[PDB]
């Protein structure tokens, strides 16, 4: 029928729905290659399905929002991972050794006073 | 600061531009927060006392 994976990366949310089909993935009313046109890391979004031999066995519809498009791509990756796990749990044996089920918790660090941007200290000259 | 220099309180400044904040408690000459009507030193001490509701220790 259909299986769901959410995923999250750097202030981005990518709801991923997976079904059987030919391998056509659409995003927010655009094909996957028109919305991420000319981005060299876009192929990493459909990377989690290369340990399961999808893209000809599967089909997807994704709705993504928030942050920048790179976080969107990686949240798509994670959401595809969880949808794939809920489809077939045995896929975990080929997923976590690849590392596609781990939530990347690297967040931008808040800015601190006395600094320029949160670590950079202002330059002194003749101490 | 100086008593007479709180003449802004009777405003009648002869011109609408001459209105400045003049923190109520300390009579601050330079740096006054308009929302509290206080200055950074008076705001600091009053928020330390606990007389400004809702004011907590910011941390994140």
């Amino acid at each position: 029928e259909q299986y769901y994976g959410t995923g999250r990366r750097k202030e981005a949310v990518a709801r991923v729905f997976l079904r059987p089909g030919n391998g056509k993935v659409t995003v927010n009313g655009q094909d996957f290659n028109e919305y991420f046109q000319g981005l060299v890391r876009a192929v990493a979004a459909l990377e989690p399905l290369r340990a399961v031999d999808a893209l000809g066995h599967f089909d997807a519809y994704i709705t993504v929002r928030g942050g920048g498009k790179s976080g969107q791509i990686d949240a798509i990756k994670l959401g595809i991972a969880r949808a794939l796990v809920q489809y077939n749990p045995d896929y975990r044996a080929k997923l976590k050794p690849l590392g596609f089920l781990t939530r990347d918790a690297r967040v931008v660090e808040r800015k601190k006073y006395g600094k320029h941007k949160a670590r950079r200290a202002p330059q002194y000259s003749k101490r | 600061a100086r008593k007479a220099l709180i003449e802004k309180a009777k405003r009648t400044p002869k011109f609408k531009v001459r209105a400045y904040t003049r923190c109520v408690r300390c009579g601050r000459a330079r740096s006054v927060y308009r929302f509290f009507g206080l200055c950074r030193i008076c705001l600091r001490e009053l928020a330390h006392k606990g007389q400004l509701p809702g004011v907590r220790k910011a941390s994140w």
Partner: protein, 155 residues
């Protein structure tokens, strides 16, 4: 690194080749945090280097980076007055880092107008055994075999 060993960062693999050295080189090309523009530079250079010479850019890249890696260098050691240049070997990790840095710096010191063209021709020359990066490498190696009289100061 006073306390710990400063564990090496494990870079992400590459989306085109699946190789980590490609991602490291793309990072070395990146400036101001633009990995997208740097990747486009490297891959347009890949197309150019695969067309202007009918070889695979994979093994040419690998052979060039292998040709630029030096085997000895010099470090300054304070002994009996002013310090001296003491030769020694190189770590494999440091060989990798120095090779990629010399690659990028010799590529951008080239006359070619576009960045990708500079990258491609630099990789070609380095894969053939010539070029600017290999010249800097062989100067580093010429520092060795020259002040080798200090071979008893290895430390």
């Amino acid at each position: 690194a006073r306390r710990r060993r400063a564990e090496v960062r494990q870079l992400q693999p590459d989306l085109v080749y699946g190789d980590v050295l490609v991602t490291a080189f793309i990072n070395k090309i990146m400036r101001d945090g633009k990995k997208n523009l740097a990747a486009r530079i490297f891959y347009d250079a890949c197309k150019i280097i695969q067309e202007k010479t009918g070889q695979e850019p994979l093994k040419v890249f690998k052979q060039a980076v292998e040709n630029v890696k030096p085997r000895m260098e010099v470090r300054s050691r304070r002994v009996g007055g002013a310090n001296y240049q003491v030769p020694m070997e190189v770590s494999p990790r440091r060989q990798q880092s120095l090779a990629l840095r010399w690659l990028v710096q010799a590529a951008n010191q080239r006359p070619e107008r576009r960045a990708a063209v500079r990258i491609a021709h630099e990789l070609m020359d380095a894969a053939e055994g010539k070029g600017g990066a290999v010249k800097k490498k062989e100067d580093v190696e010429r520092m060795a075999e020259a002040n080798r009289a200090y071979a008893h100061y290895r430390w």
